[PDB]
Symmetry: D2
Subunit: 248 residues, 4 copies
């Protein structure tokens, strides 16, 4: 596979529906050696077994809200991989009350802080903590959403956090490029991981279907492989062309 | 002039060189009645003098880091302006260590938190706190910068906070549009007040850096009923710098 | 008003509903002296009457399909305005068959050629033909549309021609900036004058379609010294429509 | 390879330095069956032999200035491939006088017409002429340049033609998507196929090198493969992050 010889850490695997699962799947298909993180001691067993099916028993706890947890995860990772070739950041959160109704009425100082901290800062917090561990030719990948670029009802403060995240992609690419690391995002179309949101995108997307975790995983695999050696700092739309049409 | 009849609150005046100052001068030139905030004790006197020179004695304390300080400022404002026509948000900050050197090395969780809180969250915090006071036809304005869109050396986490601020403009414009409020930003070129300035002078299509007068005249337009068809827009007032490459 | 002292040429007036008409009214309201072109014999009378109502008797024929017609129009213009301050380009056309149905089936080599020639090339053709006549401080303006940026059904090859027109704005702004000329576009929302209009009304943040008055007030700003810090910009005057999704 | 079972037409191969060559190379590496066009009876032998090295003796004359030539090329192609899975458009031209000096002084009605006709219209002229021949899952690819988005000295009217071309990508994707065809562009960084232009991009690009025809070919291969099934109507920057940095 075109990831042979690569070791990639994959965050965000929570179930077989997770975008991160589809990415891990495609990467394993392409010959990558994988490691997995999990947020809390609840997902622990569930992720250990997803890992197993994908050639791996590197399953490590990490809450990205805490610098200590990120450090201790990469110290653990360093025991089996003193060096490695990048990671997939597939993590986001905002408090539930943030994401319903009029944006201005819903947003709070605290809601804004957590959304940005978990959905955007954590991407660079992970890069900081593993920087000396990355091989030349490493690639970092995060997952964004059209909410960054357009005002979408209910998406609310997550849109700001995703915009911060896409700028984070650019400043990371810029800072880490000279030492041979690429940094990109995929802006994915909607996937079941909102019933009206999915339905709308299907009717008006150029490809006339919603994208799958397989489509996103294949794009992800490519973007973390040396095939994409020419691509850095880019948000690639894997939404079947939805964002480039209007009034279909 | 073209803002006669409008009541506009102007934040962020700190000196005669402040963008907010060029904006307040331009708006007063166009007949706006103005009100002013100041952040702390150190700036109160400067802002009173500027306000007096521009016909105003509404000078109110406001530290956008705190919800209570925004709320009491608007309660104070409501005694003289029970309704008004919008505000200019000309505020941002990141701790000094954030803005020098390699971005990935410089940024910290706390530095990121403050940059976004002060430079982005505060725009919608002010809007939330005065929403019921805004007349139909109101306009809100904030100030952003090309670092929101491109990776600029040393700008670092402030680029992320400005990107969050630009999306805030879109989300606020969309939320507030139905009750008659527009929300825009000006992405200003760097203002001569250091290596970046010499660069922008040479390669900007109009062959100079923009001034606070340029910015102020665009800002007054964007807060006036002349810009009635413009909302959720980041307008580049950088002399065309951003749209050129390899000049 | 804010265009006193400016001499601006206005193309594209065809009726009281023309965007160019709202623009000419707004500029005359702001003290500009105006000049007018008309495309052909059929429109001459309408444009003379409008010009007279707005204080002008400079009404000149110009078909931008031909180099000689642009050159003689500007030679005519130079007898009354040896120098002047810019022009509003409000011209586009594609043959009728281009603009209905599947894009790939509708477009032809000839239809593409004409759409780009008339709707894009003509902006720089006019600029070339009057370059030496423009005062420092001059501004050129053209009218574009969201189809330049997104695939819109039925707009078809006109979207490609508008994209070429937007890049023309950037290349002209960059070329002409050093001698004191700015060049911008307004990307106007669809104006009520059919299913698209009902759509834009419901989902546009300001909850209405923009009017030729909205467009005209932005255009007058962009041709005035108030927009001195703005060049090579496509400003969206569509009420925020383009920056929202799934409304 | 991830193009196995695909048949792709590749235009624009003029020499071993051509972007189209690097694309053909990568595609053949990935198992695609190839066909090649050539502009004039001069390149004929030279292209026939490039083809041979890449598993192919489908080498067909085509001048994209002429509808008849495009039609007769696809009729010929139809003799060996009644159906096929898309094509690479790697064609552009403007008269030499267009591309030097002040844009406004250099541009002419005729220069503008030819630049747009050859660099932009020809992409959709090819799609029109082979539409009934495309399999579901087909992909079309063209090559653009940052000149479309920014004003670059000397690039002049080619910038307008490339902007027209990128809009063409979107309207094509929109029109052809429902019948199962994707359409994308790669905006490539500078490649030797200007000595100061290359040099500048090397110093200030995040990856600190200019991209190669191999980087572009690998991205091209991906974008014409089913791995990119989620991507349509997109201009992918394969310029090593150059366009997303400023003042480096
Ligand atoms: N889905 C869709 O459609 C989309 C998405 N996106 C994105 O991506 C990401 C991922 O997510 P998903 O896959 O989808 O889901 P899940 O599976 O559930 O996952 C999540 C995750 O995360 C994590 N976390 C949290 N928190 C935390 C964590 N970790 C660690 N630490 C901490 N603290 C968990 O665990 C899991 O695993 C994301 O990012 C997304 O985004 B978003 O915003 C969205 C959605 C939807 C739609 C849109 C958007 C969802 N979600 N989100 C979030 N969360 O953020 C993109 C596109 C599309
Ligand atoms: N300059 C230039 O070039 C620019 C700018 N920009 C922007 O805008 C704004 C404003 O700025 P300026 O005017 O310039 O400055 P100053 O005067 O200093 O001011 C500021 C203000 O704020 C305030 N604050 C703070 N914090 C706070 C406040 N208030 C309240 N509360 C609180 N807490 C003070 O007081 C004053 O007044 C801004 O936003 C800006 O941005 B930035 O980032 C930038 C710069 C430069 C360049 C670029 C950018 C600077 N600064 N910044 C900040 N700070 O943020 C835009 C464009 C341009
Ligand atoms: N409307 C709306 O919605 C819009 C529009 N836009 C644009 O802008 C311009 C103008 O339009 P309007 O005003 O609307 O129309 P009218 O009135 O018809 O006008 C036109 C003009 O032009 C001229 N021409 C032609 N050809 C020629 C000329 N001149 C000279 N020479 C030659 N050859 C006539 O005469 C008249 O005056 C334009 O550009 C527009 O665009 B488009 O595309 C559109 C529409 C609609 C919608 C969208 C778009 C219509 N039309 N168009 C054309 N035509 O092109 C913008 C936005 C909006
Ligand atoms: N190079 C670089 O850097 C770049 C490029 N790009 C693009 O891509 C394409 C391709 O080109 P190249 O590869 O580069 O080159 P070559 O090899 O030489 O090729 C060309 C071709 O074409 C053809 N043709 C022409 N005409 C015609 C034809 N065919 C057919 N028919 C007709 N009529 C020939 O044969 C050959 O093969 C292109 O498109 C490009 O673009 B551009 O604009 C550019 C350049 C440079 C830089 C930039 C840009 C060059 N060139 N070009 C043109 N031509 O167009 C992209 C990016 C980069």
């Amino acid at each position: 596979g075109f990831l042979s010889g690569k070791r990639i850490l994959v965050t965000g695997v929570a179930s077989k529906l997770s975008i991160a699962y589809g990415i891990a799947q495609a990467m394993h298909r392409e010959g990558a050696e994988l490691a997995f993180t999990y947020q809390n001691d609840k997902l622990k067993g569930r992720v250990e077994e997803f890992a197993a099916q994908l050639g791996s028993d590197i399953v490590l706890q990490c809450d990205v809200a805490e610098d200590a947890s990120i450090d201790t995860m990469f110290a653990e990772l360093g025991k089996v991989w003193p060096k490695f070739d990048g990671f997939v950041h597939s993590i986001g959160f905002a408090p539930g009350d943030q994401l319903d109704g009029d944006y201005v009425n819903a947003v709070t100082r605290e809601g804004f802080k957590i959304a940005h901290d978990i959905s955007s800062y954590s991407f660079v917090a992970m890069a900081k903590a593993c920087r000396s561990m990355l091989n030349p030719g490493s690639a970092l990948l995060t997952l964004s959403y059209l909410g960054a670029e357009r005002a979408i009802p209910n998406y609310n403060v997550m849109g700001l956090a995703k915009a911060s995240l896409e700028a984070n992609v650019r400043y990371m690419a810029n800072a880490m490029g000279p030492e041979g690391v690429r940094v990109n995002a995929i802006s994915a179309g909607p996937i079941r991981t909102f019933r009206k949101m999915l339905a709308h995108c299907e009717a008006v997307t150029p490809i006339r279907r919603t994208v799958t975790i397989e489509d996103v995983g294949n794009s992800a695999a490519f973007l973390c492989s040396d095939l994409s050696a020419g691509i850095s700092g880019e948000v690639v739309h894997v939404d079947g062309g939805f964002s480039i049409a209007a009034m279909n």
